[PDB]
Amino acid sequence: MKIEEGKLVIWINGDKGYNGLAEVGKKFEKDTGIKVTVEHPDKLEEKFPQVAATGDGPDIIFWAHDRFGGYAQSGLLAEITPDKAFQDKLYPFTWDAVRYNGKLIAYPIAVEALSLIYNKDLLPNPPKTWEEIPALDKELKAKGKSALMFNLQEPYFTWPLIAADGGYAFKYENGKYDIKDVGVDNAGAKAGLTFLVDLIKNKHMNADTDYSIAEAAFNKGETAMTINGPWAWSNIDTSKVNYGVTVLPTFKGQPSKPFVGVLSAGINAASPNKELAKEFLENYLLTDEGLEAVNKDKPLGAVALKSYEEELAKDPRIAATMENAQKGEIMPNIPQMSAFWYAVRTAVINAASGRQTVDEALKDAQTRITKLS
Ligand SMILES: OC[C@H]1O[C@H](O[C@H]2[C@H](O)[C@@H](O)[C@H](O)O[C@@H]2CO)[C@H](O)[C@@H](O)[C@@H]1O
Ligand SMILES: [Cl-]
Numbered sequence: 395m396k397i398e399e400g401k402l403v404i405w406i407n408g409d410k411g412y413n414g415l416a417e418v419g420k421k422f423e424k425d426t427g428i429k430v431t432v433e434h435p436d437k438l439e440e441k442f443p444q445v446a447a448t449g450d451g452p453d454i455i456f457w458a459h460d461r462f463g464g465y466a467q468s469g470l471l472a473e474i475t476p477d478k479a480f481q482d483k484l485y486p487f488t489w490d491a492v493r494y495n496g497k498l499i500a501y502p503i504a505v506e507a508l509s510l511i512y513n514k515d516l517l518p519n520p521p522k523t524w525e526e527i528p529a530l531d532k533e534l535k536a537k538g539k540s541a542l543m544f545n546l547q548e549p550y551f552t553w554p555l556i557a558a559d560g561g562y563a564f565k566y567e568n569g570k571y572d573i574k575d576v577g578v579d580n581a582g583a584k585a586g587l588t589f590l591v592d593l594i595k596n597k598h599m600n601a602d603t604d605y606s607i608a609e610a611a612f613n614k615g616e617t618a619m620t621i622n623g624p625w626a627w628s629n630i631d632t633s634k635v636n637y638g639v640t641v642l643p644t645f646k647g648q649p650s651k652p653f654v655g656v657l658s659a660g661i662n663a664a665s666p667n668k669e670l671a672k673e674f675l676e677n678y679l680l681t682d683e684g685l686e687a688v689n690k691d692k693p694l695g696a697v698a699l700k701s702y703e704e705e706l707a708k709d710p711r712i713a714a715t716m717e718n719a720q721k722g723e724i725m726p727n728i729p730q731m732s733a734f735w736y737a738v739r740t741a742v743i744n745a746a747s748g749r750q751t752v753d754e755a756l757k758d759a760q761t762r763i764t765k766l767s
């Protein structure tokens with residue numbers, strides 16, 4: 395689909411509320427005459443650089459903020475310059491996540507953090523620790539159930555455990571990330587992934603489990619727990635599993651530390667519709683009504699808009715989200731995050747499969763990330 399003056403094309407990931415977003419687009423069109431088309435292509439975060447230059451891309455792109463520094467480095471993102479009245483409507487820490495080399499490069503939408511989701515009927519008192527999960531699984535196995543299933547194919551979901559005892563991406567000191575100081579093969583990182591691989595070795599998890607398999611198992615009442623973000627809650631509502639949302643398990647006494655993402659809306663620097671895009675985002679999406687439409691489709695998490703978040707904060711699933719966020723850390727947005735995620739993806743998949751030892755998988759990932767910085 396070709397970008398065109400007088401229409402808006404929006405890209406957002408397939409696990410988000412694109413139908414709720416399309417409803418906001420319908421209100422925009424009712425007021426302005428401007429058609430808004432929402433798409434959720436596969437690997438949209440990887441396709442965006444090419445199509446921006448060829449003309450086949452979106453006016454507006456949604457992703458977690460960690461991807462946006464690499465986009466800005468390549469010139470792909472229009473600078474965002476809201477008036478103070480609008481800026482004041484969103485939490486300052488969300489604007490911080492979309493600031494890159496002194497410019498705002500997107501609008502923040504909502505704060506995402508993984509939580510432990512658990513079946514209250516199978517497991518009224520979920521474990522506080524990772525160490526408790528093997529024996530819990532053993533008991534559940536004798537009932538033809540399992541303790542825990544989550545996506546092992548995306549490193550996003552395993553990172554809270556790796557980080558718990560000391561793993562980190564890039565060392566952060568005095569407001570700057572030291573791209574030479576990577577923490578993916580330190581003792582903390584090794585201990586977390588070793589624990590995960592030992593679960594697999596002892597048949598308390600399966601190396602092959604992905605997003606679909608874990609969501610299906612939890613929503614069919616086959617596993618007592620999953621790890622996932624707020625977007626998953628609506629499919630769980632539909633299944634009417636009785637579920638809670640709670641703090642992630644500790645490891646070696648330390649909290650799991652999920653990498654926190656700010657879902658953000660960037661404007662294609664080459665869009666012929668930059669003003670319309672700002673008009674849509676500031677006056678239609680980032681309002682109580684616009685976010686509620688999306689949120690009702692797939693829950694956004696802790697939205698960046700203060701007025702609406704004051705309502706959402708009363709939901710215990712949102713408070714659990716923010717507690718896990720506070721124990722974790724905001725992702726960097728620096729361009730090196732792409733290589734970080736690719737290298738750690740390989741390391742988790744190879745360690746979990748037994749293709750490599752934990753120590754060699756993380757050492758190779760550490761080396762790749764460092765040499766590429
Ligand atoms: O697994 C590496 C990717 O992790 C995050 O992607 C998250 C994203 O924040 C969340 O909204 C989405 O729905 O789940 C994915 C994991 O599949 C980073 O935002 C990505 O840049 C990383 O590639
Ligand atoms: Cl610009």
Ligand SMILES: [Cl-]
Nearest residue numbers: 520521522523
């Ligand atoms: Cl417990």
